[PDB]
């Protein structure tokens, strides 16, 4: 369902205002995800894309969600006056719980998650990482 419109009309974009290594992902013409080159904290890239193409942004290491233009998804519009579209990528409001969980997933190896001194559900919250595919069902 979430598969890029094959318009073939170019649109240039300027892409990172977050303490993350952003991974840009494009959703292809058939709906399959394709990862593009990563952007370190504070970096800019001018890039070429196309009108009605579906982009989303994640953290490259941990797969976490990142916002673009204060929203969850980005689509190139028209390059009016030939000007490239801006894609200002930033952190979402993460919960205090998750801001803490990020930290736990990053220090402990997955094999030792069920050894932690917590109730079952907090293991099941650890083992449900930021799975991109499940967010595509949420966006659909």
């Amino acid at each position: 369902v979430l598969r890029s419109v094959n318009s073939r009309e170019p649109s240039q974009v300027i892409f990172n205002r977050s303490p993350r290594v952003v991974l840009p992902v494009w959703l292809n013409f058939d709906g399959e995800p394709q990862p593009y080159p990563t952007l370190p904290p504070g970096t800019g890239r001018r890039i070429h894309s196309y009108r009605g193409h579906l982009w989303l942004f994640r953290d490259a290491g941990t797969h976490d969600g990142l916002l673009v233009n204060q929203t969850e998804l980005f689509v190139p519009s028209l390059n009016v006056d030939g000007q490239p579209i801006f894609a200002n990528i930033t952190l979402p409001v993460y919960t205090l719980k998750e801001r803490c969980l990020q930290v736990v997933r990053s220090l402990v190896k997955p094999e030792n998650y069920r050894r932690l001194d917590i109730v079952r559900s907090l293991y099941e919250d650890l083992e449900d990482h930021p799975n991109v595919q499940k967010d595509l069902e949420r966006l659909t």
Partner: protein, 83 residues
């Protein structure tokens, strides 16, 4: 307007009522005592409220919420406690 939050070590944190109400748990629980939250965690919980308030939908680029590792675990408890 304010509310009082008292750590396990008796430190009393007085915060903007609104900042406190940020927590689903504090909303649940105006002088709350936290026999299980020592003043280093509580002060950072208060920093998080202050942070969330100041940086939630702010024009200035959002800096990462720094958390010290040692308190990350106690603050995780307080976060999972507070929600």
């Amino acid at each position: 307007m304010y509310v009082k939050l008292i750590s396990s070590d008796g430190h009393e944190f007085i915060v903007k009522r609104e900042h406190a109400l940020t927590s689903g748990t504090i909303k649940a629980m105006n002088e709350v005592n936290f026999r299980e939250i020592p003043s280093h965690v509580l002060s950072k919980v208060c920093m998080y409220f202050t942070y969330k308030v100041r940086y939630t939908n702010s024009s200035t680029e959002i800096p990462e919420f720094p958390i010290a590792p040692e308190i990350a675990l106690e603050l995780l408890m307080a976060a999972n406690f507070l929600d």
